[PDB]
């Protein structure tokens, strides 16, 4: 679920960079119970793809 975070992660850096509250909001709004929810529903396997051999 870190791969998906990388998406909004960019916003984390934008926290310093004063950008369009709307634009920055686009990346934020991009995280809904539909999309961001799907990412967590797909990242499950994505993360499992490399199941810790441990």
């Amino acid at each position: 679920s870190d791969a998906v975070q990388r998406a909004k992660e960019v916003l984390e850096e934008i926290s310093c960079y004063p950008e369009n509250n709307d634009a920055k909001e686009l990346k934020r709004i991009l995280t809904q119970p539909h999309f961001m929810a799907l990412l967590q529903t797909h990242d499950v396997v994505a993360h499992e793809v490399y199941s810790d051999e441990a």
Binding site: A3, V4, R6, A7, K8, E9, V10, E12, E13, I14, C16, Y17, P18, E19, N20, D22, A23, K24, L26, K27, I29, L30, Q32, H34, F35, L38, L39, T41, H42
Partner: protein, 53 residues
């Protein structure tokens, strides 16, 4: 006729590239967001979501 979020999913790549015009936003991460935003899995998975819904 569909969710705006999906439509904005593409238009977002525009705003991102616009805000990234500040320099102080390593396009590395910004671009990384595009890889996920432009990810095919989004539509592939999104398809199931709609199916289930």
């Amino acid at each position: 006729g569909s969710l705006n979020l999906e439509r904005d999913v593409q238009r977002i790549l525009e705003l991102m590239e616009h805000v990234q015009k500040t320099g102080e936003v390593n396009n590395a991460k910004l671009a990384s967001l595009q890889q996920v935003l432009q990810s095919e899995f989004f539509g592939a998975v999104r398809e199931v979501y709609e199916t289930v819904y």
